[PDB]
Structures are given as structure tokens and as C-alpha cells.
Amino acid sequence: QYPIINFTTAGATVQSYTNFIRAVRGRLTADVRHEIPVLPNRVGLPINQRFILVELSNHAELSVTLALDVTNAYVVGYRAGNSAYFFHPDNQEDAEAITHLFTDVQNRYTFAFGGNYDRLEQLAGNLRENIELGNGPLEEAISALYYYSTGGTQLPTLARSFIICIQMISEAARFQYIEGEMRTRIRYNRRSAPDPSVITLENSWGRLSTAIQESNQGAFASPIQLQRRNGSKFSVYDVSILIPIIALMVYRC
Amino acid sequence: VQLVESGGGLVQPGGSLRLHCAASGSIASIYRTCWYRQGTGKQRELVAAITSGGNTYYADSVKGRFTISRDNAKNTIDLQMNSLKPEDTAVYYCNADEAGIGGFNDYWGQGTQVTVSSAHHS
Ligand SMILES: [Cl-]
Ligand SMILES: [Cl-]
Ligand SMILES: [Cl-]
Ligand SMILES: [Cl-]
Ligand SMILES: [Cl-]
Ligand SMILES: [Cl-]
Ligand SMILES: [Cl-]
Ligand SMILES: [Cl-]
Ligand SMILES: [Zn+2]
Ligand SMILES: [Zn+2]
Ligand SMILES: [Zn+2]
């Protein structure tokens, strides 16, 4: 079995969430470009090292297990009880790879949609900008994912639940900044949608990975434009300013 | 795919009904088949569901009393309703929903009235 990291929303604290995200980042990844860890190169990565599993539980003591691809930290599918569900693969190699996940489940399904936000938002009937994140949302998403396996969850609710999980797990692993946003929500017992600073970072993760690894001794060939909390645009010209912001990058050749 | 419900009616509290839904096409590959209900002036709510794999879901309000069944050869979906209560009064709808597996088609029946009541006093 692939490595498993457990998290529960029941009695969750800033510390327990912090420990969780640190453990996830630890199973995902020392190999650093300009001070920032790089995820493993897909080329040369054996299939038995391709995925990690995140098992989420809630107050209702329901559990689901998400499968993340270590090459990009992103969710590819999940297991609930005797069933597993996978986003539609982009290519034949990826489709073959996911056959290695959850091999003992009785029922396997592939969705007719991929796991990218632009599509998930359409299916959810809401933009990320209007979907609350926090411990409450995560608790509800876990129940929704679980009940999708028994018929009790409609597609829009499922898609919304994926959007919640991906941001609170994958994007938090990718960015200390987003991890900090989730910690703040936990600390003050709040639920709220991500602001433009978060959305733009999420959207820019691939571009930042490329800019950082292609940089000239840390300096960007061309500036990357991000947004502040209030939506105003600013430019980043250097890797150094991003060190406290981005935790992991996709490997670039 | 067309869905046609039947078997609704009036029962006294404690009574039983069995709702029937006939699909005009194959439901074998349709992920979710469900019963929803809508009471007067309220929003439609999920009552029970069964997947193409045989897993089931029941709303808290009906657990123990209702049983959903599904026949993938005859293309029918049934709801056995026991120990009915006035609170169960509603229009019941059958739903066949691909739910993002294989496609996005979502079929609804026209609905059937269920009324749980003592005799009227006209
Ligand atoms: Cl935990
Ligand atoms: Cl450097
Ligand atoms: Cl699980
Ligand atoms: Cl290849
Ligand atoms: Cl396909
Ligand atoms: Cl904090
Ligand atoms: Cl009928
Ligand atoms: Cl009379
Ligand atoms: Zn293989
Ligand atoms: Zn019948
Ligand atoms: Zn009357």
C-alpha cells in the first residue's frame, strides 16, 4: 500500500492541521531549486512511488481516502467504503497509472469530467470565490464524498466537495500562504471563501514553478503578476520574495 | 428516458404503500436511481437512493421504514413505505441520474401524491 496520512476534522486544531500538512509535504517530497523543494520528476518515478493517500475522517466518523499524485500534489480520485472514483484521465499513461490505486475495491468508476477547477466550478454551480473553506466545509465535504458512494450525494455537491478538499489539502501543501489561510480559519472557528490572493496563487502554481526553475540566479526573466487580498495587481520579480509563500513546485525539465 | 411513477394514494397513519417507477429505457448503467419528495410549499428533498452497484442511502427521517429497490433488467425502481406518518405526506418523484459517471443526464418522473391522514370530515 502507498503511504497514508490521516486527518480528522473532529477536534481539529491549528496544530493538528499544521502537523497534517507538514506530513503530507513530507510524503510528497531535500531536492531544491533556489531554496524551494521540487516534486519528483514523473520521468523515472516508479509506479510504487507515484501516489500518496490522505485519509480524512469527521465527527460522524465517516472516512474517505483521497489519492494524490506526487508529481503535482493534486487529487486524482478517492475511495469510500467498497468503491473508488477517479477524475477522467488526460492520457493513456495516467489512465494506466490509476489502475494501481485502491485495487481491492469492489466498484471502480471513472468520472466523465477532469478535476480542474474551471470544470469543477461549472459542475458545482459555484466559483471558488463563492465556496466557503474551513473546518466546517471540510467536515461537510467528507460526508458528501462518502455518501456519493451510496447514492446520497448529487453531482453539484460532490464537485463542490472536491473543490473544498483540493484547496484545503493540495493547495495548502503547495503554498505555506494557503496553509496559513486555512490555519487562520481554524484558529478563529470561521468559514469563508478564498480571496483573490488565494485564487491567483492557485491559478499561478504552474507558472511560478516554471519561472522559479528557469530564473537567472533567482531573478525572473519576466515578472509574474499576482493579486493582493483586495484584488489589486502586483508584480513579482525574484524567487526570494516567494520563499515564505510557495512550498513545493512541479518539476520542470 | 422517460420515468412513470405509480402506487401513490391515501393511507391512514401506520399504513403502507409501495411506489413503482417504470423507466422507458435501460437504467442498468445509470449510477443513481432515487426517490425524492416535496411537501406542500416546501423544497424537494432526497428520500432514498440506490446505486448501480447496489449501495443504498436513506434520509434519517425514513430509515427503517422505507426500502428502495432497483431492477436493472426490467428497468424499474421501487419504494416500499411502511409505518407511514402524516409527515410523510408529499408528492414523491423518481429520479434516474448519471451523476457525472458516463454522462450528465438526469431524468425525473412526473410525481405521485402520497397522503397519510385520518378520514376527512366534510
Ligand atoms: Cl488529525
Ligand atoms: Cl538561487
Ligand atoms: Cl477511507
Ligand atoms: Cl511517456
Ligand atoms: Cl472517457
Ligand atoms: Cl494562525
Ligand atoms: Cl409506474
Ligand atoms: Cl360525512
Ligand atoms: Zn500498471
Ligand atoms: Zn414496482
Ligand atoms: Zn376531503
Q: What is the resolution of this structure in A?
A: 1.6
Considering only CA atoms, which of A85, A89, A90, A88 is closest in space to residue A108? A85
Gap between the terminal Cα atoms of chain A = 29
Active site (annotated) includes residue A74: yes
CB contact (8 A) between residue A155 and residue B97: yes
Measured N-to-C along each axis, helices A176-187 and A196-213 cross at an angle, to the nearest 10 degrees, of 160
CA-based nearest residue to A86, from A71, A73, A98, A97? A98
Residues 6+ apart with CB under 8 A from A176: A244, A245, A246, A247
- Decide if A151 and B104 are in contact by the 8 Å CB cutoff: no
Helix (H, G, I), strand (E, B) or coil at A75: strand
Question: Which residue from A117, A205, A214, A98 is spatially nearest to A164, judged by alpha carbons?
Answer: A117
What does the alpha-carbon distance between residue A47 and residue B21 come to, in Å, rounded to a whole number?
46
Elucidation method: X-ray
* Residue A131 near residue A163, CB atoms below 8 Å: yes
User: Computed from CA positions of residues A6, A8, A11, A15, in that sequence, does the dihedral angle turn out positive or negative?
Assistant: positive
CA-nearest of B18, B30, B17 to B75 is B30
Exposure class string for A46-56: b at 16+ Cβ within 10 A, else e: eeeebbbbbeb
Cell digits for A151?
Answer: 447514492
For helices A155-165 and A117-124, give the axis angle rounded to 10 degrees.
140
Between strands B90-97 and B32-38, the pairing is antiparallel
Q: Which residue has the cell 514523473?
A: A42
Which H/E stretch holds residue A107?
strand A107-110
Nearest partner of B2 among B78, B81, B80, B105, judged by Cα? B105
Q: Is residue A134 domain-shared with residue A229, that is, in the same domain?
A: no
Three-class secondary structure of residue A51 per DSSP: strand
Any B CB within 8 A of A155 CB: yes
Q: Which ligand is closest to the CA of A183, given by its number?
A: 6
- In this structure, how many other beta carbons lie within 10 angstroms of the beta carbon of residue B19? 25
Distance spanning both ends of chain B, measured CA to CA: 41
CA B6 to chain centre: 10
CA distance A21 to A29: 12
A161 at interface of B, judged by CB pairs closer than 8 A: no
Residue B49 near residue B68, CB atoms below 8 Å: yes
A53 Cβ contact list (under 8 Å, min separation 6): A1, A2, A3, A4, A5, A65, A66, A67, A68
| Shared-domain flag, residues A42 and A119 | yes
Range of the domain at A187: 174-253
Domain chopping of chain B, boundaries: 1-122
Residue by residue, DSSP assigns B76-104 as: EEEEEE-S--GGG-EEEEEEEE-TTSS--
Do A39 and A162 share a domain, yes or no? Answer: yes
Nearest to B19 by CA among B89, B67, B75, B83: B67
A83 touching B, CB under 8 A?
yes
Residues of A in contact with B100 (CB under 8 A): 111-113, 123, 155, 158-159
Say how far apart CA A104 and CA A109 lie, in whole Å: 13
Please name the residues in contact with A66: beta carbons below 8 A apart, sequence gap of 6 or more.
Answer: A53, A54, A55, A56, A75, A77, A78, A165, A169
Give the residue from A82, A109, A160 with the most B CB atoms within 10 Å of its CB, the best one to mutate.
A109
Which one of A119, A150, A173 terminates a domain?
Answer: A173
Is the domain of A250 the same as that of A184? yes
Q: Are residues A42 and A73 in the same domain?
A: yes
Per-residue CA distances from B65 to A62, A161, A223, B16, B85 (Å):
23, 30, 64, 9, 10
Strand pairing partners for A33? A36
Residues A52, A30 within the same domain: yes
Give the separation between CA A141 and CA A161, rounded to whole angstroms.
4
Last residue of a domain, one of A173, A190, A221: A173
The DSSP bridge pattern shows strands A51-57 and A4-8 to be: parallel
Q: What is the CATH number of the domain that holds A218?
A: 4.10.470.10
CA distance B82 to chain A (A): 21
DSSP string, A202-220: HHHHHHHHHHHHT-BTTEE
Q: Are residues A181 and A236 in the same domain?
A: yes
Strand B112-116 relative to strand B9-11, pairing: parallel
Judge whether A77 is annotated as a binding position.
no
What's the helix, strand, coil split of chain B in %, to 5?
A: 5, 50, 45
How many CA atoms, within 13 angstroms, populate the side-chain half-sphere of residue B22? 4
3-state secondary structure of B39: coil
Place of cell 477547477: A117
User: What distances in angstroms separate CA B53 from CA A31, A85, A149, B28, one per listed residue?
Assistant: 44, 13, 9, 10
Do both A22 and A82 map to the same domain?
A: yes
User: What residues pair up with B66 in beta bridges, in sequence order?
Assistant: B81
C-alpha dist (Å) from residue B15 to A219, A235, B11, B51? 77, 70, 6, 27
Distances (CA, A) of A220 to A72, A102, A223, A227, A236: 22, 41, 6, 18, 8
CA–CA gap between residue B67 and residue B56 (Å, rounded): 9
| Boundary residue ending a domain (A173, A188, A206) | A173
Query: Residue A233: which H helix or E strand, with range?
Result: strand A233-238
Residue A151 in contact with residue B49, Cβ under 8 Å? yes
CA gyration radius for chain A?
18
Q: Are residues A65 and A190 in the same domain?
A: no
Which chain A residue is nearest to residue B96, measuring alpha carbons? A151
Which amino acid would we find at residue A91? N
Distances (CA, A) of B28 to A144, B6, B62, B120, B121: 24, 21, 26, 42, 46
Contacts of A111 in chain B (CB under 8 A): 100-101
What is the C-alpha R_g of chain B? 14
Number of domains in chain A: 2
* DSSP conformation letters of A55-71: EEE-TT--EEEEEEETT
What whole-number distance in Å separates Cα of residue A77 and Cα of residue A53? 10
CATH of the domain at A36: 3.40.420.10
Q: Enumerate residues 6+ apart whose C-beta is below 8 A from B77.
A: B21, B23, B27, B33, B35, B50, B68, B69, B70, B71, B94, B96
* Gap between the Cα atoms of A176 and A248, Å rounded: 9
The span from the CA of A214 to the CA of A233, in Å, is 23
Contact A152 B57 (CB under 8 A): yes
How many CA atoms within 13 Å lie on the side-chain side of B47?
A: 28
Task: List, in order, residues 6 or more apart from B113 with CB less than 8 Å away.
Answer: B8, B9, B90, B91, B92
* CATH superfamily of this structure's domain B1-122: Immunoglobulins (2.60.40.10)
